[PDB]
Amino acid sequence: QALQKYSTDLTARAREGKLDPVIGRDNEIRRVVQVLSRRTKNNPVLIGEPGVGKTAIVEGLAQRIVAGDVPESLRDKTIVALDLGSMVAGSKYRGEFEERLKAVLDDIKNSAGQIITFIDELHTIVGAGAAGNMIKPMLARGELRLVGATTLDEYRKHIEKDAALERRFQQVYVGEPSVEDTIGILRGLKDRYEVHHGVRITDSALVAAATLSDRYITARFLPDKAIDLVDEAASRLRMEIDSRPVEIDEVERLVRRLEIEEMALSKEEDEASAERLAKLRSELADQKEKLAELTTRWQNEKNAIEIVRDLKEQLEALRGESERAERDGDLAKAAELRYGRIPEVEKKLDAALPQVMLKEEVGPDDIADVVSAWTGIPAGRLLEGETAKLLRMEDELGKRVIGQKAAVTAVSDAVRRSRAGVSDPNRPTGAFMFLGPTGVGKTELAKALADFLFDDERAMVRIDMSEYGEKHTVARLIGAPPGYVGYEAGGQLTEAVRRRPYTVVLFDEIEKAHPDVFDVLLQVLDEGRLTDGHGRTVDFRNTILILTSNLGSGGSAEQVLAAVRATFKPEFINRLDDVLIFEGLNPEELVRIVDIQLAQLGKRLAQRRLQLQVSLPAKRWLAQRGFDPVYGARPLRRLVQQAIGDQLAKMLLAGQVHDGDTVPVNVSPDADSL
Amino acid sequence: VGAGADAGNMIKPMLARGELRLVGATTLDEYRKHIEKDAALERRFQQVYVGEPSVEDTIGILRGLKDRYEVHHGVRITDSALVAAATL
Ligand SMILES: Nc1ncnc2c1ncn2[C@@H]1O[C@H](COP(=O)(O)OP(=O)(O)OP(O)(O)=S)[C@@H](O)[C@H]1O
Ligand SMILES: Nc1ncnc2c1ncn2[C@@H]1O[C@H](COP(=O)(O)OP(=O)(O)OP(O)(O)=S)[C@@H](O)[C@H]1O
């Protein structure tokens, strides 16, 4: 009675069909049976990584027994799964727990060879005492079966430490299934999710949800890292087929919130607030417009679907009538229906029939959208709005960087070549090095690129190679070996990519580092991974590595290349993408930097409503004064500051330039007045 | 992970079957220190990365929360101040 009291049957649940299909894994069940029905050491223990499927095999064996496909001496066994969590509970006296264990063991002893005990998470029996050692006597006679399943490391962490027991067990290895076996298991399990949710599931989806989740989720194992995607896409589609679909359910909520905020911002007795109120209304209206446009779209197709349906119904009614005409022998209506009314409505149906958005089944891209919500990595289809930004990318980078089209092109052509699903999948999404004279942009372009993709300049992982001067500093970006002072901290680079692996990495002044920090970027590049202290393996197959330097600084093109081939390894300059070289600024190009800097300054002193008004000779002199062709565009910034900001501050903190003003600037013989 | 002395371990069966719904919240760098050690457990969990907002939306959050403090402290708060309390 103790068995039915504490433990729980498994074959009884199998009889009610409460288990899931167990597609595949015949070799492992064969091995488990041929080990279980042995004479001695009749105790199998399943060993495998978490997620490979280790309880599923035992459920499959239970199904096989209840079906009757097992060898001779395995008929009507009634496998039982223990529960020590329920066994040791409220047994708060000296002689209760071991007594209950003795009772269970004796009730198992009674049944000669029927009961096949099963313990999931076998490692829980190493303690449980204050005991748990009343298993060696029974296993010393082969009186139990006791199939168990644990993970790989907990085995050597809780059992191998007790090498007496490990002698009495027989190991079975369970490796992860490959992509085809995973597709098979998914095609087997599709039905249960189809019935639990309320939607259909195609097969191209079951193929994509297996080929993707092996490439992107590099932390789990197939039989579940593939199931999760489908089981999330199904629920998303059910929620969509409920009240209004996604991409409307967000615009509506943004519009309502904007209306609420404006309804109380309007009643403000201020002047600073009177200008921020003039943009709130603008955006609210410009989004009301989009909500209206989107609403009509989904509202129609809706009607079209209903039309089609009606036409189907009508058709069928006529078909039923042609049957009847033949039942009644009515020729007048017989063919009138059979080649008149029926094909008439059929054609009408067919004409409306082509009538996307929320079709009614999880396509091959809902899985991709789920994977994109996961891991932040976007793998979609260039949904007709981003394919315009990815064409204006160059002209848009031209808003912050000027000139250097030779580099802006080779930077842009490294993103579309990955969006179009073309570039190699085992290499970073692009890793190339800038080098040239100082003050040209080789750091500003990396910032402009890292903002084109995230809209916040601080979201790029950044490490300065000017500190890593010796070997022993390499451990700063990889963590520390096992068992040292700083070990619960991990690395500094690695940890910024193991979370949100879509960032953009920037190595500043690569040549200032010790030529052993170079020796880890060898396997960073051209393979896209490295191993930190804890043995983990992060994956750079989606990052965009960028490197800057200042080598040579004087050569046309061959002296800088000589410096590179002398200070870099051939097997390290052989892995990179195009090695771009910048040109330098010209007396013409400086005006388009001058006006950018002046707009920057106007935006800076704009929180106090203090816009400027610059003159044409002012800009021309300001560009023709600071130009020297050795320090790039920094002297221009210094000159702007020293020539405008100091006079402006002198005038400002002496009154007379109070808030809400606009001062004009004009040229005097050498300096410029205000 | 604690409570033991075989604890937070009797919940592994019920988790993998979806019986009890679980909703949690742990800071980003104690996860990898107390959970990812036990990958047998963190398999059962679905991660939801929560990135920090920007100033333009912090403005909105403050505009919504203003009235909750207006009542607590018997004062009034300017929107030109709710903007500065985020830009600054
Ligand atoms: N061969 C298979 N046939 C059908 N479903 C499978 C198969 N292998 C795995 N699965 C499914 O994939 C999941 C596997 O989860 P489990 O095997 O219970 O995890 P586990 O293998 O027990 O790992 P631990 O150590 O218990 S965390 C379940 O949802 C199973 O239904
Ligand atoms: N091509 C450019 N376009 C716009 N601003 C630029 C450009 N080159 C330099 N600047 C300005 O100069 C600063 C950026 O200097 P950078 O050239 O990026 O420094 P750097 O590229 O790291 O060069 P070094 O050799 O490392 S000092 C910012 O204040 C920019 O406004």
UniProtKB/Swiss-Prot annotation, chain A:
Positions of the UniProt region annotated as NBD2: 386-584
Positions of the UniProt region annotated as Linker: 177-376
Subcellular localization, per the record? Cytoplasm
Keywords associated with the record: ATP-binding, Chaperone, Coiled coil, Cytoplasm, Nucleotide-binding, Repeat, Stress response
Q: Which residues bind ATP 1?
A: 48-55
Chief subcellular location equals cytoplasm
Q: NBD1: where is this region?
A: 1-176
What start-end ranges are recorded for coiled-coil regions in this protein? 227-355
> A Gene Ontology MF term for this entry?
ATP binding
User: What subunit structure does UniProt give?
Assistant: Homohexamer. The oligomerization is ATP-dependent.
What does the entry's free-text domain comment contain?
A: The Clp repeat (R) domain probably functions as a substrate-discriminating domain, recruiting aggregated proteins to the ClpB hexamer and/or stabilizing bound proteins. The NBD2 domain is responsible for oligomerization, whereas the NBD1 domain stabilizes the hexamer probably in an ATP-dependent manner. The movement of the coiled-coil domain is essential for ClpB ability to rescue proteins from an aggregated state, probably by pulling apart large aggregated proteins, which are bound between the coiled-coils motifs of adjacent ClpB subunits in the functional hexamer.
Function of the molecule = Part of a stress-induced multi-chaperone system, it is involved in the recovery of the cell from heat-induced damage, in cooperation with DnaK, DnaJ and GrpE. Acts before DnaK, in the processing of protein aggregates. Protein binding stimulates the ATPase activity; ATP hydrolysis unfolds the denatured protein aggregates, which probably helps expose new hydrophobic binding sites on the surface of ClpB-bound aggregates, contributing to the solubilization and refolding of denatured protein aggregates by DnaK.
Q: What is this protein called?
A: Chaperone protein ClpB
The shown residues of the full protein are 159 to 845 of 848
Curated annotation (Swiss-Prot), chain B:
Instruction: Look up the domain of life of the source.
Output: Bacteria
* Disulfide partners: none
Subcellular location as annotated: Cytoplasm
Q: What does this protein do?
A: Part of a stress-induced multi-chaperone system, it is involved in the recovery of the cell from heat-induced damage, in cooperation with DnaK, DnaJ and GrpE. Acts before DnaK, in the processing of protein aggregates. Protein binding stimulates the ATPase activity; ATP hydrolysis unfolds the denatured protein aggregates, which probably helps expose new hydrophobic binding sites on the surface of ClpB-bound aggregates, contributing to the solubilization and refolding of denatured protein aggregates by DnaK.
Its UniProt domain note says: The Clp repeat (R) domain probably functions as a substrate-discriminating domain, recruiting aggregated proteins to the ClpB hexamer and/or stabilizing bound proteins. The NBD2 domain is responsible for oligomerization, whereas the NBD1 domain stabilizes the hexamer probably in an ATP-dependent manner. The movement of the coiled-coil domain is essential for ClpB ability to rescue proteins from an aggregated state, probably by pulling apart large aggregated proteins, which are bound between the coiled-coils motifs of adjacent ClpB subunits in the functional hexamer.
Q: Which family does it belong to?
A: Belongs to the ClpA/ClpB family.
Q: What is this protein called?
A: Chaperone protein ClpB
Q: What is the lineage of its organism?
A: Bacteria, Bacillati, Actinomycetota, Actinomycetes, Mycobacteriales
What gene is behind this protein?
Answer: clpB
Which part of the full protein does this chain span, and how long is the full protein? 284 to 377 of 848
